[PDB]
DNA sequence: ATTATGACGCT
DNA sequence: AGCGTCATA
């Protein structure tokens, strides 16, 4: 009891842009606003592949990974925006630059960890402490939380969605002990006040809407964020975890969506996160290893210690292209032309990176896939990256992979290449 | 014939 | 180092 940690020491938020590439395109083209619409890459093959979908289009059943031609069968009036093509490939620069807009605003409030192109974690523990001393034991008004859900409320002894949200928020605020500067629930609440402010700033200054989760760690904050999308934020308290987890499929928790989560389910014969509490730490470590076992033991109790890392910039800069089915690269000059295309985009992004961020990459990673291999990558080789020159990088890439060519004819490439990948890594200050 | 990424774990 | 896992638009 007295010595049992509860993982309530931090306030952590996760901010995730709603339908992000779609919002980037809707800001640019007002005709797409408030419409079923999606973002697609390429066209020729089945109308192109969908990579983002507006909430209006989701109502028709449109999803990511859908071919646009198939999406049009569900939603005939679906509007589409295409990813830019440069040097024969999709080019995601517009969305990377829009990401920077948002990340720079968030950084004004706190240290952030860039977790994807459209989301970052925030450690708000310090900011909350400051805001609490500004508040002077003064109660938090519902007006300060106009888009916040309190997960698990209302409960106990109106049929509209916004009405339910306010009911829950009222119950929460009615219970709050604002006289205690160290109450975790109060700290989360002030955290939510700050995230309302952050989200207002993002929308004001970019036009983009986002959702957010506020909790005591990254996993709960990420989970919370998704609970009420779009354009809303959700507070998941330590106390809300047993009920939340009692019906929460294991695969919904970050890092458990794949093989490990499948094994937790199969080996233990359970379905929900909460069911993990019935195993000892040693039992979990026996099945899933020392690190995963300890992580699972604490996580199913709502506790996790992974820090919000102070990193706003990506650690690698990469440029990849698939060559599916019949477009697979079967000649040396094909291979060399596409290495150059990739290397030219890589040089452009690397040079911009060096100017913006005062750093230089020092290692070039080259990866290919061969036709037939089920694995995404077949072969990965590194070499020195000593100069930002596309022709040098592409010549070097060819050198490190050219021995993969089984063909007795050096003119021909076999087995044909179905993927090329160039990645700059190992940055040093400059 | 989802594709284009990007972080981190294992040995 | 090279490979695998898991994640996001
Ligand atoms: Ca998003
Ligand atoms: Mn996201
Ligand atoms: Mn998504």
The protein footprint on chain C, as nucleotides within 7 A of a CB, is 1-9
Nearest to residue A318, comparing CAs of A423, A398, A181, A217? A423
Please give the distance, rounded to the nearest whole angstrom, from the Cα atom of residue A100 to the centre of ligand 1: 15
Tokens of A103: 């990340």
d(CA A338, CA A413): 13
Q: SS3 sequence, chain A?
A: CCCCCCCCCCCEEEEEECCHHHHHHHHHCHHHCCCCEEEEECCCCCCCEEEEECHHHHCCCCCCCCEHHHHHHHCCCCEEEECCEECCEECCHHHHHHHHHHHHHHCCCCCEEEEECCEEEEECHHHHHHHHHHHCCCCCCHHHCCCEEECCCCCCCCCCHHHHHHHHHHHHHHHCCCCCCCCHHHHHHHHHHHHHHHHHHHHHHHCCCEEEEEECCHHHHHHHHHHCCCCCEEECCCCCHHHHHHCCEHHHCCCCCCHHHHHHHHHHCCCEHHHHHHCCHHHHHHHHCHHHHHHHHHHCCCCCCCCCCCECCCCCEEEEEECCHHHCEEEHHHHHHHHHHHHHHHHHHHHHHHHHHCEECCEEEEEEEECCCCCCCCEEEEEECCCCCHHHHHHHHHHHHHHHCCCCCCCEEEEEEEEEEEEEECCEEC
Contact partners, residue A112, CB within 8 Å, separation at least 6:
A103, A106, A120, A121, A122, A308, A310, A312
| Sign of the torsion formed by the C-alpha atoms of A296, A302, A304 and A310 | positive
Q: CB within 8 A of A296, min separation 6: which ones?
A: A264, A276, A284, A288
Instruction: Determine if residue A103 is labeled as part of a ligand binding site.
Output: no
In Å, what is the separation between the CA of A371 and the C1' of B9?
27
CA of A60 to the centre of ligand 3 (A): 17
Given a contact cutoff of 8 angstroms between Cβ atoms, the answer to whether A172 and A139 are in contact is no
Greatest C-alpha distance within chain A: 80
Determined by which method? Answer: X-ray
Q: Is the CB of A399 under 7 A from strand C?
A: no
Q: Which residues pair with A41 in a beta bridge?
A: A49
Resolution (A): 1.7
Bases on strand B under 7 Å from any protein CB: 1-10
Nearest ligand, CA A211: 1
Ligand approaching nearest to the C-alpha of A21: 1
The structural domains of chain A, ordered by start, are: 1-18+89-249 (3.30.70.270), 19-88 (3.40.1170.60), 250-307 (1.10.150.20), 308-430 (3.30.1490.100)
* A17 marked among binding-site residues: yes
């Amino acid at each position: 009891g007295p010595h049992m940690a509860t993982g309530q020491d931090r306030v952590v938020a996760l901010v995730d842009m709603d339908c992000f590439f779609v919002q980037v395109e809707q800001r640019q083209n007002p005709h797409l606003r408030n419409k079923p619409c999606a973002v697609v890459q390429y066209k020729s093959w089945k109308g192109g592949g969908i990579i983002a979908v507006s909430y209006e289009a989701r109502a028709f059943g449109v999803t990511r990974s859908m071919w646009a031609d198939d999406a049009k069968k569900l939603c005939p009036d679906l509007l589409l925006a295409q990813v830019r093509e440069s040097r024969g490939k999709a080019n995601l620069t517009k969305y990377r630059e829009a990401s920077v807009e948002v990340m720079e605003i968030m950084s004004r409030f706190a240290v952030i960890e860039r977790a994807s192109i459209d989301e970052a974690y925030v450690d708000l523990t310090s900011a909350v402490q400051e805001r609490l001393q500004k508040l002077q034991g003064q109660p938090i008004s519902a007006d300060l939380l106009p888009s916040t859900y309190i997960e698990g409320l209302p409960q106990g002894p109106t049929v509209q969605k916004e009405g339910m949200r306010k009911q829950g928020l009222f119950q929460w605020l009615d219970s709050l002990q604002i006289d205690n500067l160290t109450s975790p629930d109060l700290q989360l609440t002030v955290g939510a006040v700050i995230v309302e402010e952050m989200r207002a700033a993002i929308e004001r200054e970019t036009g983009f809407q986002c959702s957010a989760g506020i909790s005591h760690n990254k996993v709960l904050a990420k989970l919370a964020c998704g609970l009420n999308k779009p354009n809303r934020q959700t507070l998941v308290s330590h106390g809300s975890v047993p009920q939340l987890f009692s019906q929460m499929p294991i695969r919904k928790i970050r890092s458990l969506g794949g093989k490990l989560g499948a094994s937790v389910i199969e080996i233990l014969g359970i379905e929900y996160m909460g069911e993990l509490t019935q195993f000892t730490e040693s039992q979990l470590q026996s099945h899933f290893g020392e690190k995963n076992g300890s992580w699972l033991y604490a996580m199913c109790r709502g506790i996790e210690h992974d820090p919000v890392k102070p990193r706003q910039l990506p650690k690698t800069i990469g440029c990849s292209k698939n060559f599916p089915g019949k477009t697979a690269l079967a000649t040396r000059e094909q291979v060399q032309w596409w290495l150059l295309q990739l290397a030219q985009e890589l040089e452009e992004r690397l040079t911009k990176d060096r100017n913006d961020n005062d750093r230089v990459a020092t290692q070039l990673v080259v990866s290919i896939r061969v036709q037939g291999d089920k694995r995404l990558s077949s072969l990965r080789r590194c070499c020195a990256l000593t100069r930002y020159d596309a022709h040098k990088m592409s010549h070097d890439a060819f050198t490190v992979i050219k021995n993969c060519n089984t063909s007795g004819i050096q003119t021909e490439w076999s087995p044909p290449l179905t993927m090329l990948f160039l990645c700059a890594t190992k940055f040093s200050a400059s």
